[PDB]
Design a protein around this nucleic acid. Sequence first.
RNA 1: GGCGACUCUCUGGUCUGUAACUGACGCUGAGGAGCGAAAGCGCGCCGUAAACGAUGAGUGCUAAGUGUUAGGGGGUUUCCGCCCCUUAGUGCUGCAGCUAACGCAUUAAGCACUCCGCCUGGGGAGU
RNA 2: AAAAAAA
Lengths: 149, 101, 708, 64
Amino acid sequence: KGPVAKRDVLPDPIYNSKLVSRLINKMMIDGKKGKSQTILYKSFDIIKERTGNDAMEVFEQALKNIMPVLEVKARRVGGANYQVPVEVRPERRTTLGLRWLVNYARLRGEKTMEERLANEILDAANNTGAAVKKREDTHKMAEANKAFA
Amino acid sequence: NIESGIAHIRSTFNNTIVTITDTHGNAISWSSAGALGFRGSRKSTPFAAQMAAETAAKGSIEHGLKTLEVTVKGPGSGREAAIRALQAAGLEVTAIRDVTP
Amino acid sequence: KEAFMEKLLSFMKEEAYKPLTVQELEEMLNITEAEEFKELVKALVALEEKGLIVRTRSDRYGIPEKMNLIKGKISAHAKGFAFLLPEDTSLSDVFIPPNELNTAMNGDIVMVRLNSQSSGSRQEGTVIRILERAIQRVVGTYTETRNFGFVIPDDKKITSDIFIPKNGKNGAAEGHKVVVKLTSYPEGRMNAEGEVETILGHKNDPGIDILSVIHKHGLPGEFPADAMEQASSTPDTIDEKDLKDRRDLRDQVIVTIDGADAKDLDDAVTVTKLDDGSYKLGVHIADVSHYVTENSPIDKEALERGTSVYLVDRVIPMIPHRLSNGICSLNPKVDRLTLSCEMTINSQGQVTEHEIFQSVIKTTERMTYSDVNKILVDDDEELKQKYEPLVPMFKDMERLAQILRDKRMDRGAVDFDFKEAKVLVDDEGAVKDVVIRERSVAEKLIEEFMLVANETVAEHFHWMNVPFIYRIHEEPNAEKLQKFLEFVTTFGYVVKGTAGNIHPRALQSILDAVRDRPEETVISTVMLRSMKQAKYDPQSLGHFGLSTEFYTHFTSPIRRYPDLIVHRLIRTYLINGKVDEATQEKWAERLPDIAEHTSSMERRAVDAERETDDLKKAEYMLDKIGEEFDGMISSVTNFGMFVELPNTIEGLVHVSFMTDDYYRFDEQHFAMIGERTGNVFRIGDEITVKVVDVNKDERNIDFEIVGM
Amino acid sequence: KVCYFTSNGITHIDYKDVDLLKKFVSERGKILPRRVTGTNAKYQRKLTAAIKRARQMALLPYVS
RNA sequence: GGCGACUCUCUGGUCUGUAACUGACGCUGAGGAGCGAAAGCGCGCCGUAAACGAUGAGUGCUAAGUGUUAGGGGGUUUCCGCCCCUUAGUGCUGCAGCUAACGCAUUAAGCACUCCGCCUGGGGAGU
RNA sequence: AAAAAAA
């Protein structure tokens, strides 16, 4: 009945970003947060070595491009079947940002995850790749059925 | 060339008709929401009645009318708009009369 | 068909295009044949289907794409939704759902995108951009949480509580009414933040209720120091040098007639009957432009104010109390400077000869409106005997008034005779009684005299062809009046005329027919709600609601800045003779900005005055919860019907208290109809109501129906 | 809410006095109810007859 | 049972007021006669009807409060006005009393008296 | 809610 408070994650110790921590917890498998803490700090050294920019400048830029603005929600009042355009709450933006970032990074062709996650962030930051596309995809779809809401 | 006339408005829930006559009930002109190409819910609306009256009225001014008695029929939403469309077309409205059966 | 559609779209794509009806489009394209008219209609339908044009709910066609939008002002509601009031007032309102406001607040000029699908009767829209921010200050009640404040806004149209950071508190305790300046606006889910600019006091302290109103509109407080220095330096008696070049009238029979409690006497009058049967009327107004010169301290302040304001308990004056109740005031039996308008008036109320000049008067007696009624109407022998030398003039004034009233009404002026409240308070500001304010014979006499003097001054300066300020009242809104005309055909009142070319007299024909009917108060009130407000301007465009071509306000420069300018332009053009091109260009630059300002300062006075009245009515009804009163349905809405009492107090009957049936609103009839019972509550019915609840802070009176 | 006829002491309403009767009909020319016009029941009937005899003689309209 | 346009012709009943007269000339009323729905059927005939406020008729007595229709008297009132008493009718509340209870309550279903119709377990059977 | 006009 009353919106449950989301769990207050700690800031990532080296970038002081609760966003970066949330990425670690998204990447973590079978409660192996160590593996994911390593992978990211390996991925961000890869980003900083290639770009020269701070990984935080790139990662925040990457999230901007992945983060959705409007989403499709199924509404079936009587008939309807209306894909109601819904504005993504700022918490659900980051959610879907990090979910897609990780989900598509794992699917990439590169051998190691630290490289796969680095390359998906670098592609996301350049407003390209698959995770940015996925945001576009649902917006193209939300624009397509925009006459409901 | 007749000056005085009656503007017989039928406003149903489907449609607004407007016939304009002479005093002996011979038909000078007419129009209707349907004659103007409105269809469905639009034919009921007071806007369609307004436009119906103007088209009927502008047909009548060619035959050279000036004064209109009005007779309204039916429960529809047109009569108030359609009457002020007759005043706005130019023709003066002496008296209106609800002749709903 | 397609070439015609392109030609219409190209015409509508011109920069000067405004949204037009089919009839306006017909006129603008010079369509004269019935077949070309059919072609336009089919084209408008086809383009509207394609979404290349949009029909507004006021039946006007505009290109969305140049918008896909409409520019307009937000009118917010307290439940969280809003309406867009377009800039083009001929367009209809656009409903804005609470989620689609996108940080817009009440009064913000915005752009709104038009939604293709509407969920109801009205056209829906989303706020895409905010062009101008209206609200920069917010009054409210401060509240203290652990680590931060908030302020609950008194404007309930601001639905969200204003966050106060701990360093912005500035001393504000729990329950203190506070002014708050906005530092930030709302963004997403974050509320607006601020800083306490001022503490008023506690919300339970006497007079803070009104003071909160004064701050809510942004009404002027105390006078600046340089104004109070100028006022304190102004002499309390006339200097002999100022009597030069003024017509002496001190020996003539002149009187002020005002309210018993009025200290700001603007006007003094005289009426002499001439040998031919015509009347000589002298109107002698307080010469405020002498003591408040151009670009003095008091002038800068009196421009900033725009008008005096007449709240329940107090007066916020335009000029200092030392001036307004001292030297400008036409006080009894003391020498006073005036600017007079003396008029010879024949047996049909036409002004044949007039003169506007500087004078000194000495008023014979200060009357009241109650004393003057007792002499004329009630035929009171004690008061006649007391005022025996003035009694013949008071009867000569009465006959002149009638003659001027008979002229006015024959020219087609709309007499809008409604019952207004007057609230009666004690010295603390607590409410004693709400009585009817009656317009007697003595007020309507003074009314008519002021009117003719205001008419005679305007006319003189229009023919002079110099820059001047006029009080104009435009033609009413053609859509609003179209809806007014419909409403009166339901009661059987059949008007002669159309909404785009009504003569004022036609509206008076209605108001004479309904007189002493139950329907009166509401048809009266509904006509009103089709009228435009009157404003000042530099151009002569006429006054619709007096049915004249020439009008200005001249007869109250103590309490209206536009009147005070009329006194300076009269001194400039007539007395001094300064009709040079450089003088004219100076005023021709300045009057558009004064006219716009002073207009907006009047509407800010009215809104505020009313808001104190409605507060003190509500304060009146707090001890009347449970009591049964007879009344009359003043308004009917989708959510209920409003009821007016016999002291003008208004209250709502919410549909949720109509427990005997499921009520449906009929928009055409103005009625609440029961589905089962077949009971029909209409605008204009007499009903008995009981008082259920009274909320002083919100200014709500809730009623329930006992019987019809 | 006073009766015209009780007030002015009028004991006989006359179908020929049209300018009186017209005070009691609507603009359409329907008779106005007694609760609107303040009229006494006694007079309302008389009035009702008059208007009807008027209307027969085309002094008033049946329907304006 | 019913009876709603207006006018005209003919005709019935009711109420108020004053008492000029009459001087118990009254009341109820089986039968009978007349009136009397869709009626049911050939206007005639049918002759019954929740033709049930489910409450015979007539008379007298027995707290109040309030509304309305047609009146009467007084009060001041110009008249109107409102105020008050009183009559007849029609309503809503409400005593006392009555009721099994619901209710009724000066329009009694209260308290009395006269006369009439009618009832006496359900069904069988309105056969 | 909503007009003049007054104050």
